[PDB]
Tab-separated table of C-alpha atoms and ligand atoms in Angstrom:
chain	number	residue	atom	x	y	z
A	1	UNK	CA	6.457	-66.988	20.587
A	2	UNK	CA	7.121	-70.651	21.365
A	3	UNK	CA	6.065	-74.055	19.966
A	4	UNK	CA	5.385	-76.931	22.374
A	5	UNK	CA	5.013	-80.575	21.471
A	6	UNK	CA	3.415	-82.738	24.181
A	7	UNK	CA	4.460	-80.330	26.968
A	8	UNK	CA	8.084	-80.246	25.814
A	9	UNK	CA	9.652	-77.054	24.392
A	10	UNK	CA	10.452	-77.146	20.662
A	11	UNK	CA	11.640	-73.646	19.814
A	12	UNK	CA	11.015	-70.001	20.398
A	13	UNK	CA	11.844	-66.835	18.535
B	15	UNK	CA	42.753	-107.699	9.422
B	16	UNK	CA	42.260	-103.980	8.850
B	17	UNK	CA	43.084	-101.727	10.449
B	18	UNK	CA	40.209	-99.523	11.593
B	19	UNK	CA	37.377	-97.748	9.771
B	20	UNK	CA	35.687	-94.470	10.784
B	21	UNK	CA	32.027	-93.586	10.515
B	22	UNK	CA	30.897	-90.041	11.395
B	23	UNK	CA	27.246	-89.605	12.336
B	24	UNK	CA	25.154	-86.435	12.441
B	25	UNK	CA	22.642	-85.622	15.239
B	26	UNK	CA	19.026	-86.847	15.145
B	27	UNK	CA	16.733	-84.282	13.441
B	28	UNK	CA	14.550	-84.238	16.526
B	29	UNK	CA	17.526	-83.227	18.676
B	30	UNK	CA	18.689	-80.425	16.317
B	31	UNK	CA	15.116	-79.040	16.083
B	32	UNK	CA	14.107	-79.202	19.709
B	33	UNK	CA	15.755	-76.663	22.029
B	34	UNK	CA	14.945	-78.938	24.955
B	35	UNK	CA	17.137	-81.762	23.516
B	36	UNK	CA	20.896	-82.006	23.010
B	37	UNK	CA	22.159	-82.736	19.448
B	38	UNK	CA	25.578	-84.423	19.133
B	39	UNK	CA	27.810	-85.742	16.396
B	40	UNK	CA	29.206	-89.231	16.886
B	41	UNK	CA	32.648	-90.348	15.596
B	42	UNK	CA	32.636	-94.166	15.582
B	43	UNK	CA	35.826	-96.168	15.128
B	44	UNK	CA	35.384	-99.885	14.219
B	45	UNK	CA	37.906	-102.716	13.708
B	46	UNK	CA	40.194	-101.316	16.384
B	47	UNK	CA	42.627	-104.202	17.191
B	48	UNK	CA	43.256	-105.752	20.620
B	49	UNK	CA	47.014	-105.272	20.025
B	50	UNK	CA	46.584	-101.442	19.633
B	51	UNK	CA	43.232	-100.307	21.143
B	52	UNK	CA	44.532	-96.768	21.695
B	53	UNK	CA	42.880	-94.190	19.467
B	54	UNK	CA	43.600	-90.454	19.264
B	55	UNK	CA	40.654	-88.173	18.256
B	56	UNK	CA	40.903	-84.600	16.875
B	57	UNK	CA	37.678	-82.546	16.496
B	58	UNK	CA	37.178	-79.334	14.509
B	59	UNK	CA	34.276	-76.931	13.940
B	60	UNK	CA	34.687	-75.068	10.601
B	61	UNK	CA	38.381	-75.894	10.549
B	62	UNK	CA	38.990	-74.788	14.140
B	63	UNK	CA	40.036	-77.443	16.731
B	64	UNK	CA	37.659	-77.987	19.680
B	65	UNK	CA	38.394	-79.643	23.021
B	66	UNK	CA	35.032	-80.501	24.572
B	67	UNK	CA	34.453	-83.980	22.988
B	68	UNK	CA	34.121	-87.012	25.334
B	69	UNK	CA	35.149	-90.596	24.685
B	70	UNK	CA	32.639	-93.302	25.430
B	71	UNK	CA	33.583	-96.510	27.212
B	72	UNK	CA	35.523	-98.794	24.851
B	73	UNK	CA	33.190	-101.636	23.659
B	74	UNK	CA	34.402	-105.224	23.282
B	75	UNK	CA	32.903	-106.595	20.040
B	76	UNK	CA	34.047	-110.174	20.732
B	77	UNK	CA	35.249	-110.514	17.134
B	78	UNK	CA	38.890	-109.504	17.814
B	79	UNK	CA	37.873	-105.808	17.619
B	80	UNK	CA	36.699	-102.915	19.793
B	81	UNK	CA	34.331	-100.164	18.886
B	82	UNK	CA	35.781	-96.815	20.036
B	83	UNK	CA	33.535	-93.761	20.055
B	84	UNK	CA	33.951	-90.016	20.485
B	85	UNK	CA	30.853	-87.804	20.983
B	86	UNK	CA	30.724	-83.991	20.463
B	87	UNK	CA	27.806	-81.879	21.590
B	88	UNK	CA	26.773	-79.356	18.944
B	89	UNK	CA	24.915	-76.091	19.477
B	90	UNK	CA	21.484	-76.239	17.775
B	91	UNK	CA	21.966	-73.064	15.738
B	92	UNK	CA	25.511	-74.020	14.740
B	93	UNK	CA	24.210	-77.220	13.167
B	94	UNK	CA	21.355	-75.433	11.518
B	95	UNK	CA	23.832	-72.727	10.335
B	96	UNK	CA	25.721	-75.349	8.383
B	97	UNK	CA	28.996	-75.388	10.355
B	98	UNK	CA	31.369	-78.225	9.442
B	99	UNK	CA	32.254	-80.940	11.924
B	100	UNK	CA	35.471	-82.859	11.458
B	101	UNK	CA	36.745	-85.880	13.352
B	102	UNK	CA	40.293	-87.025	12.798
B	103	UNK	CA	41.241	-90.493	13.981
B	104	UNK	CA	44.848	-91.719	14.675
B	105	UNK	CA	45.913	-95.317	15.505
B	106	UNK	CA	49.104	-97.387	15.087
B	107	UNK	CA	47.370	-99.715	12.612
B	108	UNK	CA	46.833	-96.579	10.462
B	109	UNK	CA	49.467	-95.362	7.932
B	110	UNK	CA	47.744	-91.995	7.847
B	111	UNK	CA	45.146	-90.670	10.255
B	112	UNK	CA	41.576	-90.847	8.992
B	113	UNK	CA	39.567	-87.614	8.584
B	114	UNK	CA	35.800	-87.500	8.242
B	115	UNK	CA	33.655	-84.389	7.787
B	116	UNK	CA	29.894	-83.886	8.146
B	117	UNK	CA	27.442	-80.953	8.203
B	118	UNK	CA	23.789	-80.245	7.391
B	119	UNK	CA	22.923	-80.630	3.692
B	120	UNK	CA	23.569	-77.472	1.644
B	121	UNK	CA	20.571	-75.937	-0.144
B	122	UNK	CA	17.754	-73.470	0.266
B	123	UNK	CA	15.553	-74.777	3.096
B	124	UNK	CA	11.900	-75.296	2.092
B	125	UNK	CA	8.901	-75.507	4.435
B	126	UNK	CA	6.998	-78.804	4.339
B	127	UNK	CA	3.351	-78.647	3.375
B	128	UNK	CA	1.400	-80.927	5.687
B	129	UNK	CA	-1.943	-82.483	4.729
B	130	UNK	CA	-3.892	-85.122	6.644
B	131	UNK	CA	-6.082	-87.460	4.613
B	132	UNK	CA	-8.924	-89.612	6.063
B	133	UNK	CA	-9.323	-93.319	5.281
B	134	UNK	CA	-10.759	-94.087	1.881
B	135	UNK	CA	-14.503	-94.953	1.703
B	136	UNK	CA	-13.343	-98.371	0.587
B	137	UNK	CA	-11.374	-98.958	3.791
B	138	UNK	CA	-14.395	-98.545	6.099
B	139	UNK	CA	-15.245	-102.237	5.779
B	140	UNK	CA	-12.058	-103.394	7.645
B	141	UNK	CA	-11.192	-103.769	11.383
B	142	UNK	CA	-8.549	-101.065	11.285
B	143	UNK	CA	-8.345	-97.954	9.082
B	144	UNK	CA	-5.491	-95.731	7.823
B	145	UNK	CA	-4.987	-92.016	8.497
B	146	UNK	CA	-2.326	-90.510	6.186
B	147	UNK	CA	-0.114	-87.566	6.893
B	148	UNK	CA	1.387	-86.436	3.512
B	149	UNK	CA	4.370	-84.175	4.047
B	150	UNK	CA	5.772	-82.675	0.804
B	151	UNK	CA	8.101	-79.972	-0.508
B	152	UNK	CA	10.604	-80.068	2.354
B	153	UNK	CA	14.308	-79.352	2.358
B	154	UNK	CA	16.492	-80.606	3.680
B	155	UNK	CA	15.244	-84.122	4.332
B	156	UNK	CA	15.772	-84.010	8.127
B	157	UNK	CA	12.350	-84.144	9.611
B	158	UNK	CA	10.405	-85.647	12.493
B	159	UNK	CA	6.885	-86.943	12.051
B	160	UNK	CA	4.775	-88.283	14.909
B	161	UNK	CA	1.116	-88.741	15.600
B	162	UNK	CA	-0.991	-88.101	18.618
B	163	UNK	CA	-4.473	-88.298	20.004
B	164	UNK	CA	-5.951	-86.592	23.129
B	165	UNK	CA	-2.499	-85.494	24.290
B	166	UNK	CA	-0.726	-88.849	24.067
B	167	UNK	CA	1.608	-90.237	21.417
B	168	UNK	CA	0.206	-92.861	19.142
B	169	UNK	CA	2.887	-95.454	18.529
B	170	UNK	CA	1.067	-97.582	15.843
B	171	UNK	CA	2.191	-95.614	12.786
B	172	UNK	CA	4.922	-96.213	10.205
B	173	UNK	CA	6.531	-93.524	8.010
B	174	UNK	CA	8.117	-93.928	4.619
B	175	UNK	CA	11.712	-92.753	4.039
B	176	UNK	CA	11.950	-89.275	2.540
B	177	UNK	CA	11.683	-89.570	-1.240
B	178	UNK	CA	13.372	-87.093	-3.548
B	179	UNK	CA	10.979	-85.088	-5.748
B	180	UNK	CA	12.082	-83.734	-9.138
B	181	UNK	CA	12.380	-80.159	-7.823
B	182	UNK	CA	15.020	-81.296	-5.275
B	183	UNK	CA	12.712	-81.109	-2.242
B	184	UNK	CA	11.424	-84.248	-0.489
B	185	UNK	CA	8.139	-85.874	0.415
B	186	UNK	CA	7.105	-88.768	2.627
B	187	UNK	CA	3.833	-90.171	4.043
B	188	UNK	CA	3.153	-91.401	7.568
B	189	UNK	CA	0.415	-94.012	8.031
B	190	UNK	CA	-1.320	-94.227	11.385
B	191	UNK	CA	-3.356	-97.410	11.876
B	192	UNK	CA	-6.246	-97.261	14.341
B	193	UNK	CA	-9.158	-99.557	15.136
B	194	UNK	CA	-12.091	-98.591	12.912
B	195	UNK	CA	-14.096	-97.979	16.091
B	196	UNK	CA	-11.640	-95.319	17.365
B	197	UNK	CA	-12.185	-93.548	14.063
B	198	UNK	CA	-15.979	-94.198	14.369
B	199	UNK	CA	-16.091	-92.479	17.742
B	200	UNK	CA	-15.043	-89.251	16.011
B	201	UNK	CA	-11.789	-88.882	18.027
B	202	UNK	CA	-9.379	-86.187	16.886
B	203	UNK	CA	-6.062	-87.378	15.510
B	204	UNK	CA	-3.052	-85.122	14.941
B	205	UNK	CA	-0.026	-85.311	12.813
B	206	UNK	CA	2.800	-83.265	14.384
B	207	UNK	CA	5.774	-82.385	12.176
B	208	UNK	CA	9.135	-80.806	13.100
B	209	UNK	CA	11.411	-79.291	10.464
B	210	UNK	CA	13.718	-76.403	10.385
B	211	UNK	CA	11.668	-74.296	7.932
B	212	UNK	CA	8.412	-74.213	9.936
B	213	UNK	CA	7.852	-71.261	12.306
B	214	UNK	CA	9.464	-72.484	15.538
B	215	UNK	CA	10.255	-75.845	13.899
B	216	UNK	CA	6.726	-77.151	14.417
B	217	UNK	CA	3.400	-77.718	12.776
B	218	UNK	CA	0.397	-79.866	13.663
B	219	UNK	CA	-2.580	-80.824	11.543
B	220	UNK	CA	-5.632	-82.647	12.800
B	221	UNK	CA	-8.477	-84.671	11.375
B	222	UNK	CA	-11.565	-86.577	12.449
B	223	UNK	CA	-14.649	-88.263	10.969
C	134	UNK	CA	5.366	-116.560	3.841
C	135	UNK	CA	2.088	-117.115	1.980
C	136	UNK	CA	1.365	-114.325	-0.527
C	137	UNK	CA	-1.155	-111.604	0.435
C	138	UNK	CA	-3.415	-109.578	-1.915
C	139	UNK	CA	-2.939	-105.774	-1.550
C	140	UNK	CA	-5.828	-103.377	-0.731
C	141	UNK	CA	-5.574	-100.367	-3.008
C	142	UNK	CA	-7.049	-96.950	-2.161
C	143	UNK	CA	-6.910	-93.679	-4.094
C	144	UNK	CA	-7.133	-90.650	-1.797
C	145	UNK	CA	-8.172	-87.236	-3.139
C	146	UNK	CA	-6.401	-83.906	-2.504
C	147	UNK	CA	-6.976	-82.246	0.806
C	148	UNK	CA	-9.139	-79.121	0.678
C	149	UNK	CA	-6.084	-77.495	2.252
C	150	UNK	CA	-3.857	-78.310	-0.724
C	151	UNK	CA	-6.260	-76.559	-3.127
C	152	UNK	CA	-4.366	-73.285	-2.451
C	153	UNK	CA	-1.409	-74.439	-4.721
C	154	UNK	CA	-0.872	-74.576	-8.494
C	155	UNK	CA	-0.551	-78.376	-8.201
C	156	UNK	CA	-2.387	-80.949	-6.073
C	157	UNK	CA	-1.496	-84.451	-4.839
C	158	UNK	CA	-3.437	-87.590	-5.532
C	159	UNK	CA	-2.331	-90.280	-3.092
C	160	UNK	CA	-2.474	-94.010	-3.547
C	161	UNK	CA	-2.180	-96.191	-0.432
C	162	UNK	CA	-1.333	-99.829	-1.244
C	163	UNK	CA	-1.336	-101.991	1.884
C	164	UNK	CA	-1.429	-105.562	3.237
C	165	UNK	CA	0.793	-107.022	0.469
C	166	UNK	CA	3.299	-109.842	0.623
C	167	UNK	CA	5.878	-110.227	-0.907
C	168	UNK	CA	7.306	-106.692	-1.309
C	169	UNK	CA	7.619	-106.742	-5.116
C	170	UNK	CA	4.829	-104.632	-6.591
C	171	UNK	CA	4.163	-102.294	-9.546
C	172	UNK	CA	2.023	-99.102	-9.271
C	173	UNK	CA	0.530	-97.390	-12.361
C	174	UNK	CA	-1.613	-94.230	-12.646
C	175	UNK	CA	-4.203	-93.351	-15.282
C	176	UNK	CA	-6.827	-90.680	-16.064
C	177	UNK	CA	-9.650	-91.635	-18.484
C	178	UNK	CA	-7.593	-94.447	-20.068
C	179	UNK	CA	-4.313	-92.549	-20.574
C	180	UNK	CA	-1.029	-93.240	-18.610
C	181	UNK	CA	0.026	-90.574	-16.081
C	182	UNK	CA	3.754	-90.304	-15.430
C	183	UNK	CA	4.277	-87.422	-12.994
C	184	UNK	CA	4.337	-89.561	-9.803
C	185	UNK	CA	6.799	-90.825	-7.175
C	186	UNK	CA	6.281	-94.149	-5.394
C	187	UNK	CA	7.841	-94.786	-1.988
C	188	UNK	CA	9.778	-98.051	-1.484
C	189	UNK	CA	7.737	-100.695	0.419
C	190	UNK	CA	7.692	-100.353	4.208
C	191	UNK	CA	7.441	-103.333	6.549
C	192	UNK	CA	4.109	-102.975	8.350
C	193	UNK	CA	3.250	-104.006	11.904
C	194	UNK	CA	1.314	-107.123	10.837
C	195	UNK	CA	4.286	-108.362	8.683
C	196	UNK	CA	2.789	-107.347	5.334
C	197	UNK	CA	4.188	-104.326	3.372
C	198	UNK	CA	2.622	-101.001	2.493
C	199	UNK	CA	3.560	-98.200	0.167
C	200	UNK	CA	2.290	-94.862	-1.086
C	201	UNK	CA	2.403	-93.400	-4.545
C	202	UNK	CA	1.919	-89.642	-5.107
C	203	UNK	CA	0.758	-88.260	-8.484
C	204	UNK	CA	1.273	-84.498	-8.788
C	205	UNK	CA	-1.080	-82.860	-11.279
C	206	UNK	CA	-1.723	-79.240	-12.410
C	207	UNK	CA	-4.666	-78.069	-10.360
C	208	UNK	CA	-6.381	-76.857	-13.611
C	209	UNK	CA	-7.000	-80.570	-14.335
C	210	UNK	CA	-8.432	-81.540	-10.918
C	211	UNK	CA	-10.979	-78.941	-11.998
C	212	UNK	CA	-11.515	-80.301	-15.576
C	213	UNK	CA	-12.805	-83.380	-13.734
C	214	UNK	CA	-11.372	-86.628	-15.221
C	215	UNK	CA	-11.011	-89.439	-12.618
C	216	UNK	CA	-7.422	-90.226	-11.704
C	217	UNK	CA	-6.968	-93.785	-10.497
C	218	UNK	CA	-4.190	-95.926	-9.064
C	219	UNK	CA	-3.446	-99.537	-10.016
C	220	UNK	CA	-1.093	-102.302	-9.049
D	1	LIG	C1	33.138	-106.851	14.391
D	1	LIG	O1	31.820	-106.510	14.786
D	1	LIG	C2	31.568	-105.130	14.769
D	1	LIG	C3	30.215	-104.870	15.416
D	1	LIG	O2	29.246	-105.354	14.525
D	1	LIG	C4	28.140	-105.940	15.209
D	1	LIG	O3	28.441	-107.205	15.802
D	1	LIG	C5	28.710	-108.283	14.919
D	1	LIG	C6	28.939	-109.562	15.735
D	1	LIG	C7	27.575	-108.449	13.900
D	1	LIG	O4	26.386	-108.853	14.542
D	1	LIG	C8	27.332	-107.136	13.156
D	1	LIG	O5	26.233	-107.258	12.293
D	1	LIG	C9	27.055	-106.008	14.137
D	1	LIG	O6	27.127	-104.822	13.391
D	1	LIG	C10	31.562	-104.693	13.313
D	1	LIG	O7	31.253	-103.314	13.246
D	1	LIG	C11	30.435	-102.979	12.122
D	1	LIG	O8	31.293	-102.618	11.064
D	1	LIG	C12	30.643	-102.234	9.864
D	1	LIG	C13	31.651	-102.060	8.747
D	1	LIG	O9	32.399	-103.246	8.678
D	1	LIG	C14	29.799	-100.979	10.092
D	1	LIG	O10	29.141	-100.819	8.853
D	1	LIG	C15	28.735	-99.483	8.533
D	1	LIG	O11	27.506	-99.143	9.182
D	1	LIG	C16	27.087	-97.812	8.943
D	1	LIG	C17	25.780	-97.635	9.686
D	1	LIG	O12	26.063	-97.946	11.044
D	1	LIG	C18	24.894	-97.693	11.833
D	1	LIG	O13	23.852	-98.641	11.630
D	1	LIG	C19	24.084	-99.958	12.113
D	1	LIG	C20	22.867	-100.779	11.754
D	1	LIG	O14	22.669	-100.535	10.388
D	1	LIG	C21	24.323	-99.900	13.612
D	1	LIG	O15	24.419	-101.209	14.127
D	1	LIG	C22	25.603	-99.065	13.788
D	1	LIG	O16	26.006	-98.965	15.125
D	1	LIG	C23	25.318	-97.656	13.296
D	1	LIG	O17	24.246	-97.241	14.101
D	1	LIG	C24	24.151	-95.822	14.201
D	1	LIG	O18	25.136	-95.307	15.079
D	1	LIG	C25	25.074	-93.906	15.312
D	1	LIG	C26	26.212	-93.501	16.240
D	1	LIG	O19	26.199	-94.340	17.362
D	1	LIG	C27	23.717	-93.487	15.887
D	1	LIG	O20	23.568	-92.074	15.902
D	1	LIG	C28	23.664	-91.499	17.227
D	1	LIG	O21	22.662	-92.031	18.106
D	1	LIG	C29	22.603	-91.413	19.387
D	1	LIG	C30	21.634	-92.136	20.329
D	1	LIG	O22	21.797	-93.539	20.208
D	1	LIG	C31	22.216	-89.951	19.160
D	1	LIG	O23	21.083	-89.876	18.319
D	1	LIG	C32	23.377	-89.261	18.454
D	1	LIG	O24	23.090	-87.899	18.208
D	1	LIG	C33	23.665	-89.940	17.119
D	1	LIG	O25	24.853	-89.349	16.606
D	1	LIG	C34	22.593	-94.023	15.014
D	1	LIG	O26	21.365	-93.757	15.651
D	1	LIG	C35	22.756	-95.517	14.740
D	1	LIG	N1	21.748	-95.896	13.774
D	1	LIG	C36	21.198	-97.115	13.697
D	1	LIG	C37	20.162	-97.266	12.618
D	1	LIG	O27	21.506	-98.065	14.441
D	1	LIG	C38	26.900	-97.644	7.444
D	1	LIG	O28	26.565	-96.304	7.129
D	1	LIG	C39	28.163	-98.001	6.677
D	1	LIG	O29	27.873	-97.833	5.281
D	1	LIG	C40	28.826	-96.960	4.628
D	1	LIG	O30	30.059	-97.598	4.298
D	1	LIG	C41	29.899	-98.738	3.480
D	1	LIG	C42	31.228	-99.471	3.363
D	1	LIG	O31	31.603	-99.926	4.644
D	1	LIG	C43	29.313	-98.309	2.130
D	1	LIG	O32	29.002	-99.441	1.360
D	1	LIG	C44	28.020	-97.520	2.325
D	1	LIG	O33	27.595	-97.001	1.090
D	1	LIG	C45	28.183	-96.394	3.355
D	1	LIG	O34	28.957	-95.323	2.838
D	1	LIG	C46	28.510	-99.439	7.027
D	1	LIG	O35	27.389	-100.293	6.753
D	1	LIG	C47	28.831	-101.248	11.259
D	1	LIG	O36	28.142	-100.092	11.677
D	1	LIG	C48	29.548	-101.789	12.489
D	1	LIG	N2	28.608	-102.104	13.556
D	1	LIG	C49	28.641	-101.442	14.724
D	1	LIG	C50	27.633	-101.843	15.762
D	1	LIG	O37	29.440	-100.526	14.956
D	1	LIG	C51	32.904	-105.002	12.642
D	1	LIG	O38	32.742	-104.822	11.243
D	1	LIG	C52	33.331	-106.433	12.924
D	1	LIG	N3	34.691	-106.612	12.442
D	1	LIG	C53	35.176	-107.683	11.817
D	1	LIG	C54	36.622	-107.605	11.398
D	1	LIG	O39	34.522	-108.698	11.585
């Protein structure tokens, strides 16, 4: 899965 | 009088932690003379010479010196893997070239624990109140802390430096100031935190009245 | 500038932190000028020394704030004694 912060991509694994 | 000095800067934490940003290391050369403005840069990644660094426009300082800067993009995972970045600077006002090395701090990374704390009872009498995001137990000290409400950044917060705890990990606290009436309305406020040890570099905690 | 009296608040541990062997008691000191200040912690009259205090931070209204964090064995936040922060 992925983390988003304010509609910008943080990281996925 | 000199000659030059070299300062090597690491990427911003936010750029190393966010895949959608571009981390870079910055080799800054100050006190470069007007007689000999020419600087040669050598870059290395774990001892191996790279060739993809770019030199920024020379900057007149108006104090008889230029600032001369070389920038090197780093791969996110390379930074986070602890690879060493070396910048070597040569210039005719230098007996020997100057070498500077930087990498991520060495140590076992620790997840930050993130707790949001409401204003004290005692603060409810004032025009603005304080929401606190305590972030503790993290390692290394590279971290990004921001606040939001209803989708949008809040800008009216200040965050302490990281402070070294006795166990070698760090803590800090971020204070978000809001009008007491925004708190009174029962609006949801969120403390977002980015750090290498969180799952996908991100956690968010919220609170309200 | 003219000196400003600090507001001092002691904040309890978050219900979320109660999962650990130690909890954090947080002191917010804010609205002070100048930036020289001393923070002490006590529980029922005795000094508590297991704390870290952040350096002062310049706030948006031109006063300073800081935070002090006392870390205490969670046993004790369940024996009950009031922990309190002081300047
Ligand atoms: C002639 O003038 C020049 C220019 O100076 C300016 O102009 C004059 C007129 C005056 O107004 C000065 O006050 C101005 O600075 C003089 O150049 C200065 O030389 C200093 C040494 O003599 C040098 O000191 C060292 O500074 C280091 C920190 O530098 C930071 O922070 C300062 C502010 O604190 C900032 O102004 C600097 O540019 C630099 O800023 C960081 O730069 C990096 C890289 O650009 C940024 O990181 C990048 O950012 C991008 C996006 O922007 C992206 O994120 C990239 O990924 C990332 O890499 C970073 O964001 C900037 N941060 C900030 C906060 O701005 C200190 O660490 C260093 O300390 C160390 O060494 C000391 C001994 O020297 C030790 O005591 C100490 O313990 C440390 O080990 C020094 O303080 C100044 O930086 C330098 N100023 C500039 C602008 O380069 C020159 O001295 C003068 N010459 C003569 C002969 O008079």
